[PDB]
Structures are given as C-alpha cells and as structure tokens.
C-alpha cells in the first residue's frame, strides 16, 4: 500500500512530522491555500507574452513515464525543471498535440451520461423546424426567468444529500434519505454510474449543474418557458423575429 508507505516516509524525517502532529484537522483549510503567488491583473497580456516562451505550461511529474523527451523530428516535449512551489514539471504545448497524436486510448461509454445536460441541447437542436420571418416592431419587458429547467422541486440541502450519497458513499456522515424521489434518483445514478473513472469533483459539478435551478433577469418579447430561452439570440431581435419550435 503506497498510502501507508508514503505516510511513514513523511513522518520518518524531520521538518514533516511536527507539521503533521501540530496542525489540527480544522486548520488544514487555511494552509491548503498558503501560496506565494498573486492573482493577475492583466491575463491577456501575460498569455500573449508567455506563448512565445519555450516552456509555458505545467504538467504532473508522471509525464516522465508517459511521454518522451524528443519526438520523431527532435523537438523537446518537456523540461527538467520544477515549478514554483510545487513538484510539477514545466512542459511545452507540443506535448498536448503529441498526446492527441500518438497516445493511450480509453473507452467513452460514460461521457454521454455524465454530461447529459449538454447532449440534451445537442440533440434538441438537430430536431427543430423553422418558419417565416416577421419584420416588425419588438416590444420587450424585463422579467425573471428560469435559465435551467430545474430537474427536481428541491433545494440545496437534499441536493447535497443525493450528491454525497451518489459520489461519496462511505462518508455521508449521519443522516439517511427520506422521500421516494431522492431514492429513485439515487438508485438510477447508482446503477448507471458504476465503474466510472472521471474525477469525483467533475461528477459532483455536473450533477449540481444538471439537478439545481438557476434564475436570471432578461428582456423577453415572446413566450416565457425554459426550453425557449436557451435559443433567444436567434428567435427574437429588435427589428425582426424568427419562428422556431424545438424538438
């Protein structure tokens, strides 16, 4: 087990035992963010400036066992330097193209289900019909509209409940689920999510974005429904109007 091995190797030398046995567990939230770098005021300029550098991006060290140094023609693909305050390596943007060129392949049967809320849009657009164009006045009133269908009638509490029961099962803590709808959602995701290798933060994020409701403040002139709003730039204008029924 690499876990207990690396633990024992940490608490075998100095400088690392006192930090682990002095820092309580309600304090690691602060020292996780202890950085010596600053959030940047001008990102566009820095991107344009850094793109002409030899080694502009950073990768995990495992690269040294997954990607060569010099490719078929002889262009360097990663460097031998460590980043500022981390154990990550500094790599060139040709390594991304390489990985996409001659790299390890996997399966993609779960990527549709984890990102269902996007593929809904994708195969709802290619099943819709058009009509005439009415060039006339456009009178708009500003209202509050739900910009997401809001899968369930629930709020944040039971949302975290179902998400922790589906993603982090052995650490839900104390409580159990109560009603039928949350159990149904739970078990559906239980079955259809088995044997997934996507990062659990990504699964939790997609389930939050797929399961909770968001509302905004927008100018409307036609119909007030949720499937219409996502196509709003295209249906209404200030002088014209396109007709559309999504599928």
């Amino acid at each position: 087990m690499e876990r207990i091995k690396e633990l024992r190797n940490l608490m075998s030398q100095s400088r690392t035992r006192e930090i682990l046995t002095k820092t309580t567990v309600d304090h690691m939230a602060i020292i996780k963010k202890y950085t010596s770098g600053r959030q940047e005021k001008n990102p566009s300029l820095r991107m344009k400036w850094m793109m002409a550098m030899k080694y502009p991006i950073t990768a995990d060290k495992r690269i040294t066992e997954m990607v060569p140094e010099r490719n078929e023609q002889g262009q360097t693909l990663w460097s031998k330097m460590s980043d500022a305050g981390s154990d990550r390596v500094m790599v060139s943007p040709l390594a991304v193209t390489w990985w996409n060129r001659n790299g390890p392949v996997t399966s993609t049967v779960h990527y549709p289900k984890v990102y269902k809320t996007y593929f809904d849009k994708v195969e709802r657009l290619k099943h819709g019909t058009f009509g005439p164009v009415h060039f006339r006045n456009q009178v708009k009133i500003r209202r509050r509209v739900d910009i997401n269908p809001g899968h369930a009638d629930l709020s944040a509490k039971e949302a975290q409940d179902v998400i922790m029961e589906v993603v982090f099962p052995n650490e839900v803590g104390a409580r159990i689920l109560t009603s039928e709808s949350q159990l149904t959602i739970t078990k559906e995701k239980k079955e259809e999510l088995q044997d997934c290798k996507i990062s659990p933060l990504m699964v939790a994020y997609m389930l939050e974005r797929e399961l909770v409701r968001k509302t905004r403040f927008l100018p409307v002139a036609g119909g007030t429904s949720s499937v219409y709003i996502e196509v709003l730039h295209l249906t209404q204008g200030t002088c014209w109007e396109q007709m559309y029924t999504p599928g």
């Binding site: 876990r3 075998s12 682990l20 002095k22």
Partner: protein
Amino acid sequence: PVGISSMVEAMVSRARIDARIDFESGRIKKEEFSEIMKICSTIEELRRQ
C-alpha cells in the same frame, strides 16, 4: 472537514478499517493485512506517543 485532532491520528484511524473491511472482509489476500497493521503500529509509535 472538521475536528480538533491531529492530521495523523485521523490518517491512522482511517487506515485500519480499510484493511479489515474491503481487503479482509472481502476475500482478498491475508498476507498484506499483516504488514498494513505493522506499519500502522509503527507510525503510531514514531510520534513518540
């Protein structure tokens, strides 16, 4: 995460359950359990307590 215990007490408390519950309550090898418990005891001694 919350609590007022050190970071190693927790990392050793949630390190013996995993040896006995998944790899020794499901019939996986019984020869790793030994050294797992060995190094857990070793670590909880190395802190001098």
